[PDB]
Amino acid sequence: ESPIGVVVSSRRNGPWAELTLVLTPQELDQGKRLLLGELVRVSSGGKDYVGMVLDGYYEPVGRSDPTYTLALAHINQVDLEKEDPWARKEVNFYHHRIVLLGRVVQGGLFAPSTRLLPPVVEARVYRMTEEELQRLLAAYAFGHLAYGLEEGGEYPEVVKEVDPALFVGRRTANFGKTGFGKSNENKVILTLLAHAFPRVGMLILDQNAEYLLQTEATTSPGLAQAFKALGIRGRIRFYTAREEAWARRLKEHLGTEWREYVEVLPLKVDFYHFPELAVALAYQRRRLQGAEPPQYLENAFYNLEDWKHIPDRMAYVYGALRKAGLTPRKGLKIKYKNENYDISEEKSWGNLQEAMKGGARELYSRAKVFSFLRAFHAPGKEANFLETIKEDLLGEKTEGEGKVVILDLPSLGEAADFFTLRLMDLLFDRAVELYGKRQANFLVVLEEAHNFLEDKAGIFYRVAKEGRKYGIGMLYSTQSPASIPMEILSQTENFLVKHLSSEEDVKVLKRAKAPFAFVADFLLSEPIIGYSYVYFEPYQPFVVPLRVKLLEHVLKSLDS
Template sequence: MSAIQDLVSNAVLSNSPLKILKNFLDKQHQLHSAGVKQDYRFIGYVLDLGYDTAKIITSDPYKIAVGGIPRGSFLILAIDERDEQGNPIQTGLPPHFTLLRVKSVSSTPLSNQVQHTYFELHKKSMPELDIWTQAELQWGALECDVIGMFYPKPSDKNSVEFSGDVNNVVSAHKYKVFSPDNDLLDLILNGLVNKENQQELGVFRPTECQVGLLNNNYPELKISIEDFKGRRTAMFGKTRLGKSNVVKVLADAIIRTSTTTQNVGQLIFDINGEYANDNPQDGNKSLASAHTNNCIVYALNPRNPSFKELKLNFAEQPESALPIIKSFLERDNQTSNYIKSFGNIELPSILEIKSEADKGKKIRNIRKIQMFWAILKSAGFNLDESKLISLNLSSGQINKFNPGLKIDLRNEVYGGTPPASPSNLNDLIKEFSLLATFIQNNKSSDLLRGSSEPLFDQDAIALLNFLNPASGSGTQILTSYRHYHSPSAGDFITEIIQLLNDGKTVILDLGNASEDVRKYFSDMLSKAVFASQEDKFVSNTLSDHFIQLYFEEAHNLFPNNNKENTTVYHRFAKEGAKFHIGMVYSTQSPSTISQELLVQTENFFVGHLASTHEANALSKLQHTFNGLEDDIKKSRTPGYMRILTNSHRFVIPVQVKKFTV
């Protein structure tokens, strides 16, 4: 009868992943019956079992046979009842096992007696123990967390399912505890991972300490790229311990799995230049070197002739350029009143001026832009005059570079018959410089008043005083900022959006740039990406296309104390999935990140955290890290991470592979 039952059982499990469990238990029984210790994975028995915790008793020979049982390692709890012939007793339940994670050493009912024995042993300096006492002392207990249960998926017996709770806790004596072999470990680690676009991340590493574990051939841990597309991913840990390497491995995996489909574009804000440039000193290759056909690098200071120039066109983007200039002036401690007044000006965009319906306001705004152009030209910025003329900033009498000053005002400014209206930037500099001097000397002149208000408001006066100050170096203090400008810049946003739509990986090399410049480019391109994806969503053209964004020093973009929830970055956190925008953000400290973002993050890669506060901040908002705080604080091996992805239901320790070309 048992042979028939065994045949039926094997038929039911023929295609089920849980056939591994039956084979494992059968093998362990055979090894036990034959007295063979090699490959014997038995750990011990259950002393106490609940829905959340389990206490197991074990002995030194069992622990030594499996290479040790470090804290945080996985054990399995399985019913293994057999008849006198060693055949499994049919319980009517499908094959299943409960996953345990070792939490700590626990006391046993005999702990006091054991301590008394040790005390007497050392007090009397006994040279050795008798074999019976040795056998008694080698027993101990372990406290474990009950992680959940693996069982056949009810709707598909050939698939495995996992629940975070257990619904079948029978008497403790019916269970046996085992350290899983590699086949079972592979099921535990990878059995729940989305089968589509799988990539190897690294090797399962249960503990930082490798004593007794070096010869264990642990299985590779797999991740699915589908878990990262359109989702939020956090990288936490102290610097130099592997966050950037994980980013490279992840970005590399996305490139490899989407090369043919071209359905994932990636934008990496590279604040240290490590993804765009090789680092021979550390033996590190860059992502750009690994994928020369799929990676396009834009750099503020290109270190490679193949890199594209990432510059601002100060003349055509005055509304963005002036705040950047202000940040430079503040950084360089330029505190003169006329300089601060210049930095506080808010210039309109070219588009705003062209759409202005009020003719008088439009003319005044055009003059301000022309004043700004004169300042740039005077500071030695390379401006394309023909291109500026083609912008067609004209209304009424203003054309080319003519600021449209009244003839009687020009007569006074020039002190006689004035020359023809400015037709180039040098003429414009001369006219505005003379105008600045006239205004400084004739502030109450009726020629400076219009029909109802002054011809030049405070912003215009500040521009003129900066161009030609009564004292001070004026525009010359801007000369050191010229390398951020290019007259041919301005179309890189359109280029980058198109590259992302084509499934390319774009790296913005922002190495050596100031925080303000980095933030400017991050803001500008993030808004452009969001707007592009939102337009696709509205027009129902998103299809299966995704864009992944990578941010470092994320606490600057998602600060925990920021009450402003309308920035583009918060929109990424809230609405990114809807618009097929994924986000990978890195920082050293979880506590510095917006709690709202943390709550909505699906994937975590956690290295060493230095303080209890940081570890607790993580586990407080992501409950699956509860109980792992001490391990996270103690381990400091580069690349040793604890990960949780959208597929995984529990945290897994892994040694992430080193990125190589």
């Protein structure tokens, strides 16, 4: 608890105050040192600040010629630590430069920067203790403070914890290069949240088939295996179009009791049970396209409910669906005119077609518009996966149950984009409707975010803009800050940045967040796997390096 060095200068460098530090030969010989990027405490006028070590250089002190002295000593071949202490004692100095980030006030709130410049004579620098660092971070470990790979610059007892107040309701960003720990960090956060706070729902837009089962030695285990290890039962809902294959995999990996941990559902519905759903999907498809859906489609969409009571109109609609290509189950009857056909058979279908209005006839004539729906049709399902997901996430019965929803987007094929957009729009509309009665209280995991947050009119863009009001969070990973719009980057509240190689990425990051200007050099120069620079608002508005943990070790530690 003694000052490390002596302050010998200070100034207002741009928007940040700074001051220079000097390490005397006695301290240098004792073994004291300062690591670049280290956090130190600065005392000035009875107020403690938080400073970061920025730069270090060697500069002569007093009237001396270090070059000549050292060169002459080397020439004469005199050991400089045992023969000439009086010559080694006048060249062993070293300078440091420190920047004041701000001071903590009241209930942990961070007062930024400072308008007051401290005089040299009365400014001291003390090394920060573990208790002080723990207080700084705090006001189920996610990662412990570490300064690079330097031994002695790691503090396993200083950790950052997971709290729904940090994630739910706020947007998080997760950058980094390919293969550095973004997915591992996402899974760590999700597992810790699902184990600590079971009233937080999730929606994982899986795009690589990695968040449920993962066995290959190229990524951390899957959420299913993590839940099995941690003993979390009946909380995962899997939506996929490969029910049998995924059941085989779950049986072969999770064991014979896999049905407790994972519940598998299909992404197929029978449209002969939800003609309104079919018409709504067809109408929404074009609106998500350019614009201006046709008048006949608008009329059908608005008036199918009234049409439901007229068997002739409904027969026209069912005929249109059958003509589009969708296969009905065995034994279907259609009441046209005064007759009951069986469209499941060739002759009955032909007779009905030969036999065949307020708007149904135009739909029947233009039946090719429903062809795309064959990517979802499966006779005998009657599920309405969209509605089921809506109840799973925003259901009124929950009031806190915990529900992890994973969608196997790859199984769909070329309909995944449209399906995702439609589902997100439905969920956001329901959440807006529910405002004032209950909060959604769930998180939207999004990977490869640059595909979704491009257009300003997108539903994902609107969600990113307006989700905090209704309690809808977000957590997106993109591998490159340059691919996200500045409009979103500025408004993002949390950051988790891994190694970045391109100068454009670091420039964009520092442009979006000013405090990220002090770590650009570290990011550019150090390709370390699992090293993260976290920045959380508003309690911790400064960059703190961390050492993210492996999912296997997190599981093994949480078991006890």
